[PDB]
Amino acid sequence: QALQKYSTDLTARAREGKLDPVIGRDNEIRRVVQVLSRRTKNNPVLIGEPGVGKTAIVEGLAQRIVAGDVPESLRDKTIVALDLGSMFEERLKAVLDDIKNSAGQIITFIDELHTIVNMIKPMLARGELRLVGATTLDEYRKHIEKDAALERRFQQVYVGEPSVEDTIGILRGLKDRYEVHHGVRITDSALVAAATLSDRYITARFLPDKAIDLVDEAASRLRMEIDSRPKEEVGPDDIADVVSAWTGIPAGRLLEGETAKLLRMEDELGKRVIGQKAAVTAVSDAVRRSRAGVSDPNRPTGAFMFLGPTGVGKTELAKALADFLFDDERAMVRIDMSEYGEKHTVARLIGAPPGYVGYEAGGQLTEAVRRRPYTVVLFDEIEKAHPDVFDVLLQVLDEGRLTDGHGRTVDFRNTILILTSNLGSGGSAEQVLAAVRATFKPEFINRLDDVLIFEGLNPEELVRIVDIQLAQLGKRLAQRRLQLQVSLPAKRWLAQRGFDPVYGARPLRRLVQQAIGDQLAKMLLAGQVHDGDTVPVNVSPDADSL
């Protein structure tokens, strides 16, 4: 009776009727009471993530106890809690004396007992206090997993997060508490919008609490825009607005200007990547079948690998892909699989486990994808890595998460995966087909999307490349204001001279440099071509004079 202050009550609140809204999970409450009425491995704990409603689980348990659906050994059982805000070791003895001397009738519920585990171990060894708790999977696995002394008295009970149809009524039961501060109307449309939008896209928090914070920030945004400079009720708009401002991944109804660009991706990308019709069709069909919600929910929103002959665009295409989605090139995650020539370099992209020298440094991939999980990762020269990182990527595909040294889990269900190589480089189709089937096991290539092949450059395809390179050189030497004047004969001359179909486009850059920049840099330092000038070029018998 001397515990009423250091610990609150759930028997008085039961009768006095005030209780947070509880719905569903009745099978879970039945499981809880069934495992409580056992002889061994009784008094379970709750496993999950922030935003399940496990306090709500035990609250519904208490409400059903006070209503009465219990077995014979549960005469209301007066379940209680032990306040962690009750924080020396002398008081705890008398605090636990009431629980011990009880008949197991004032059993307690230690909310978040993860870190409490000296004192309560022998006090539990006799089987007198239930010590029911509520923790998460990471804390179970790092705290109470290896100790065989306590895993004989704890039978975990897993819980299911997404419950959209009941989150509707949950919002119904909590909508009132937010219509008082925010003088706003969150319509049923807003309820079922918060319920059915942020689940697949904002998978960084969890539905029952991310949906509460979504409507909270939406009501705050509405009460904000109410003033002089920004609607009178939350609808299907401010919800999507808050969806956009979280973790960077855009997800709404439609931005009313993005539907056009997406229809025009193939054409828009053809001005930076040239040729590869099959490749552009396949890489375009891959993102449109995702932005619309057609793609599968447990998979990276894009994952394939291509290869072929050199100098064709295997990197330029991925770089243009990073360009057209983030508007800048630096927003791509790029790690080159060339340096991974030994086995033990797995911890370079994973981070060393607790207890070694480089411990707080974190990985190079998982740390860059944990925060801002929408960028595109480029695995340049995947063929070079030790055939053990391929086993990590095996887990990555078709599962969508990986663990690093510290024991946390990050998600990969909204990113794009690009891998490249040049296997064979001389086989037309069957040699390279058998080679890619033989170098990576058929159980890893099974999961992938289409493995693409680039075809190579041709004469008609090189004049446009020359035009692109010349426009680029203009952009470069525009800051000394020496805009170019080049003739179509010289254009075709370059496009013809640099053509050899074994190296691709790199000889064209080499020829452009050695042919123009040579003479241009020779003149620009001897004077007479000073700033604000336009130089012409003309095909000389062998060279091209200026």
Ligand X SMILES: Nc1ncnc2c1ncn2[C@@H]1O[C@H](COP(=O)(O)OP(=O)(O)OP(O)(O)=S)[C@@H](O)[C@H]1O
Binding residues for ATP: 48-55, 308-315
56 part of the interface to ligand X, by CB under 6 A: yes
Determine the Cα angle at 81 with ends 78 and 82, to 5°: 135
CB of 55 to ligand ADP, least distance (A): 4
* DSSP 8-state symbol, 77: T
| Distances from the Cα of 545 to the Cα of 332, 472, 512, 527, angstroms | 41, 21, 13, 17
Q: Is 234 left (phi over 0), alpha (psi -120 to 50) or beta?
A: beta
CA 473 distance to own-chain centroid: 38
210 part of the interface to ligand ADP, by CB under 6 A: no
Determine the Cα angle at 411 with ends 337 and 163, to 5°: 165
Q: Segment contacting ligand ADP (CB under 6 A): 101-109, 310-318, 369-377, 477-485? A: 310-318
CB of 528 to ligand X, least distance (A): 31
Q: Do residues 379 and 307 touch, judged by C-beta distance below 8 A?
A: no
Residue 168 CA to residue 500 CA, distance in Å, equals: 65
8, 9, 13, 21: which one binds ligand ADP (CB under 6 A): 21
9, 151, 209, 266: which one binds ligand X (CB under 6 A): 209
CB of 427 to a copy of itself, least distance (A): 14
Question: Up-side HSE of residue 49: CA atoms within 13 Å toward CB?
Answer: 13
Spell out the residues 6+ positions from residue 491 whose beta carbon is closer than 8 angstroms to its own.
Answer: 463, 466, 467, 470
CB of 207 to ligand X, least distance (A): 9
182 part of the interface to ligand X, by CB under 6 A: no
Cβ nearer to a copy of itself, comparing 257 with 442:
442
| DSSP string of 231-264, one letter each residue | --SB-TTHHHHHHHTSSS---SS--SSHHHHHHT
44, 252, 275, 362: which one binds ligand X (CB under 6 A): 275
Cβ nearer to ligand ADP, comparing 99 with 170:
170
* DSSP 8-state symbol, 90: H
* DSSP 8-state symbol, 513: I
| Distances from the Cα of 541 to the Cα of 489, 493, 500, 515, 544, angstroms | 12, 11, 21, 14, 8
CB of 35 to ligand ADP, least distance (A): 19
Q: Segment contacting ligand ADP (CB under 6 A): 2-10, 52-60, 233-241, 354-362? A: 52-60
Q: Which residues from 297-356 bind ligand X, rule CB under 6 A?
A: 310-316
Cβ nearer to ligand X, comparing 41 with 253:
41
Instruction: Write the binding mask 417 to 456 for ligand X: x where contact by CB under 6 A, - elsewhere.
Output: -----x----------------------------------
208 part of the interface to ligand X, by CB under 6 A: yes
Tokens 């009425």 identify what position?
37
22 part of the interface to ligand ADP, by CB under 6 A: yes
- Residues in contact with ligand X by the rule CB under 6 A: 20, 22-25, 40, 49-56, 134, 136, 148, 152, 170, 174, 208-209, 212, 273-276, 310-316, 381, 422, 465, 468, 504-506, 509
